[PDB]
A paper describes a structure:
For this set, the murine antibody A21 part was humanized, and we shortened the linker, connecting the two binders, to two amino acids (glycine and serine), since shorter linkers had shown superior activity. Henceforth, we reengineered the Fab interface to minimize the occurrence of these side products. We next determined the crystal structure of unliganded 841 to a resolution of 2.2 Å. This allowed us to verify that the charged residues of the designed mutations are indeed engaging in interactions and are in proximity of around 3 Å, as designed. Since a two amino acid linker of GS can only span at most about 4 Å and the HER2 ECD had been proven rigid, intramolecular binding can be excluded. Interestingly, 641 and 841 treatment decreased mobility within the cell membrane drastically; however, these scFv–Fab fusions did not induce a complete immobilization despite their high antiproliferative effect and the induction of apoptosis. When lowering the target density, 841 showed the most pronounced decrease in crosslinking rates, while the mAb combination and 441 were still able to maintain interlinking at lowest ligand densities.
The receptor tyrosine kinase HER2 acts as oncogenic driver in numerous cancers. One such driver gene is ERBB2, coding for HER2, an orphan member of the epidermal growth factor (EGF) receptor family. Here, we design an anti-HER2 biparatopic and tetravalent IgG fusion with a multimodal mechanism of action. Thus, the focus here was to interlink HER2 ECD D1 and 4 with an appropriately designed IgG derivative and to induce a HER2 “lockdown” into inactive, signaling-incompetent clusters.
Numbering used by the authors:
A (entry chain B): 1 to 134, 141 to 221
B (entry chain A): 1 to 99, 104 to 120, 148 to 473
């Protein structure tokens, strides 16, 4: 099958530059365009441009003209996008996607995406605080001041699934992220069953387990 | 079927060597001249060399004399370009073409990358026009070129296409709206009513003498704003199993007049997943997409239809145009499952003393498993209505019960949290006959 595999997530300071890669397999590399699409929080989908895999020449979206540069190395069937003078507004998921030149022209066969976070903040793991229990009771875990995204939150090492609500992360003035993970459980069980939220922050290789017992 | 296929291009270090091949098909090179024409990044077409296979007559350009060699094997029906001591200036896409002194057939070119005198004056360098516009490009010959002028069109990533030859003659297959004319050394290309597929770079060439010369190119671009796609509605709520409609309107037509195809696509976007193509050519369902998705429309309005919505169809749907640069997306349309009103269940969480160690207090009000989305949370401290220090997070719609959960955080400096003594959140929603307040003291 046609496949595009992108490089891993990146964290950069404002004003820095980032190079994202997109290894293509399963088709004749030179015969297609590699487009670069971006999704920034709340901005939808944006086409930054595409490069001919054969000519190595590009058409750029004039909104990024001069800040974005496309390249390809055919010897390794890889396409690169280099964004310079990074701003906080460039925090986004960047996708490479193939488009055809002969019969099919629609952008199909997307890469998995590359998260690029631009911030002054540095990579740090989360502080995990219990949200002690209040018919049905609610309890939770507050994962605070971690950078960059993301964080995974499970309950009882995956045993407890029903009634779990892990909210999307919020970007604080701090520039760090914090989210909440709550769960509804029958009040009576509070003294019988034990509840542990497992928090995993791979970007900093942090792993935390916290219990929420009644206050 | 005349065909020219270039091969052999690649990365060559400075002062390096490389051979390019041009395999001819459907005709014999013995019967004509073969040209190598190059195009440097961002620049125009540059004729580098020419050969007559029959007698091996070769003509080069002064730019490449002594560094480039052109040969041919009539037995193999192939032309060759040897390159040595290559310069940085040599990096370019090399096309092979053939001569009727017009370059009617071009290979799709091959990239050579060096990892370190009749003149034609084209006017204007750039040009902005709209579909339906009448456009005129001109090329002034630096001297007498009797009628020996051809016009070519080129789109990014593709080889030049012959449009006009001997200054007014329409190449087989070119549409009627294209014409060219001559007045002495003034040469004109003119497009009757600009079609969406005519936005490209146009090149004048004189075929009178040798070397053939090229104008620097006239880029024809969309005037004003980029093709804007506006979607309606911005958000959609329909019940499970019922039909969902999304419309997309384009600020100009996406229909190519030469092939009657709409360059419009429909994409689904779920959080955390890459965009998924659903429809291309405005009605062609991508192989593997579920039956229930369909696309219709043409010209400037298109419609995506989900015949019976499912919980796994909850996402943001985007229309997208690939007709002309820059390629653009619609603003998007959020589709969600419509269900019965569900009053939120309200909980309040005081700051953990563990968090109060940290020096800040976070009081949290949770609205669990409610529908619809509209919910107002107002914080009050000692019955003083608050404002300005609250932030809300919202979950994606739950797949099974189609509800939302909301978490509102009142953040205070631990000092101010020590100051006051009653904290409550008052929730307003369609499922609450009257606002519901939850409180705690310490």
């Amino acid at each position: 099958q046609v496949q595009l595999v992108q490089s891993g997530a990146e964290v950069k300071k404002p004003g820095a530059s980032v190079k994202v890669s997109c290894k293509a397999s399963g088709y004749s590399f030179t015969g297609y365009f590699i487009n670069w699409v971006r999704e920034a929080p709340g901005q939808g989908l944006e086409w930054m441009g595409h490069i001919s895999s054969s000519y190595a020449t590009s058409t750029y979206n004039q909104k990024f003209q001069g800040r974005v540069t496309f390249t390809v190395d055919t010897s390794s069937s890889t396409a690169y996008m280099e964004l310079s003078s990074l701003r906080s507004e460039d925090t986004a998921v960047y996708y490479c996607v193939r488009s055809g030149n002969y019969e099919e022209y629609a952008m199909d066969y997307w890469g998995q995406g590359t998260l690029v976070t631009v911030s002054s903040a540095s990579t740090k793991g989360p502080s995990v605080f219990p949200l002690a229990p209040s018919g049905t009771a609610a309890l939770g875990c507050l994962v605070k001041d971690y950078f960059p995204e993301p964080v995974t939150v499970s309950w009882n090492s995956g045993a407890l699934t029903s009634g779990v609500h892990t909210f999307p992360a919020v970007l604080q003035s701090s520039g760090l992220y914090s989210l909440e993970s709550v769960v509804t459980v029958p009040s009576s069980s509070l003294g019988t069953q034990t509840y542990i939220c497992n928090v995993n922050h791979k970007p900093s290789n942090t792993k935390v387990d916290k219990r929420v017992e009644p206050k | 079927e005349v065909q020219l296929v270039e091969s052999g291009g690649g990365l060559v270090q400075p002062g390096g060597s490389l051979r390019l091949s041009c395999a001819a098909s459907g005709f014999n090179i013995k019967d004509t001249y073969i040209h190598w024409v190059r195009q440097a990044p961002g620049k125009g077409l540059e004729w580098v060399a020419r050969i007559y296979p029959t007698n091996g007559y070769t003509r080069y350009a002064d730019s490449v004399k002594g560094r480039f060699t052109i040969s041919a094997d009539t037995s193999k029906n192939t032309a060759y370009l040897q390159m040595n001591s290559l310069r940085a200036e040599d990096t370019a896409v090399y096309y092979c073409s053939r001569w009727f002194y017009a370059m009617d057939y071009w290979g799709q070119g091959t990239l050579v990358t060096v990892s370190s005198d009749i003149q034609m004056t084209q006017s204007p360098s750039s040009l902005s026009a709209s579909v339906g516009d009448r456009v005129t490009i001109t090329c002034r010959a630096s001297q007498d070129v009797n009628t020996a002028v051809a016009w070519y069109q080129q789109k990014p990533g593709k080889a030049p296409k012959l449009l006009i030859y001997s200054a007014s003659f329409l190449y087989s297959g070119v549409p009627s709206r294209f014409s060219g004319s001559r007045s002495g050394t003034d040469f004109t290309l003119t497009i009757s009513s600009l079609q969406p597929e005519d936005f490209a770079t146009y090149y004048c060439q004189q075929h009178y003498t040798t070397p053939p010369t090229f104008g620097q190119g006239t880029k024809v671009e969309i005037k004003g704003s980029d093709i804007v796609l506006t979607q309606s509605p911005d958000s959609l709520a329909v019940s499970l199993g019922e039909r969902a409609t999304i419309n997309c309107r384009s600020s100009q037509t996406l229909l190519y007049s030469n092939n009657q195809k709409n360059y419009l696509a429909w994409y689904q976007k779920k959080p955390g997943q890459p965009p998924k193509l659903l429809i291309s050519w405005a009605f062609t369902r991508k192989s593997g997409v579920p039956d229930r998705f369909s696309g219709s429309g043409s010209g400037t309005d298109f419609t995506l239809t989900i015949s019976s919505l499912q919980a796994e169809d909850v996402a943001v749907y985007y229309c997208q145009q690939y007709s002309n640069y820059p390629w653009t997306f619609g603003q998007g349309t959020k589709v969600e499952i419509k269900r019965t009103v569900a009053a939120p269940s309200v909980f309040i969480f005081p700051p953990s003393d563990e968090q109060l160690k940290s020096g800040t207090a976070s009081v949290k009000c949770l609205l669990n498993n409610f529908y619809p989305r509209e919910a107002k949370v107002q914080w009050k401290v000692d019955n003083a209505l608050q404002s300005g220090n609250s932030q809300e997070s919202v979950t994606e719609q739950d797949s099974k019960d189609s509800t939302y959960s909301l978490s509102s955080t009142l953040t205070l400096s631990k000092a101010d949290y020590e100051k006051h003594k009653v904290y409550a959140c008052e929730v307003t929603h369609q499922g609450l006959s009257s606002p519901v307040t939850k409180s705690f003291n310490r």
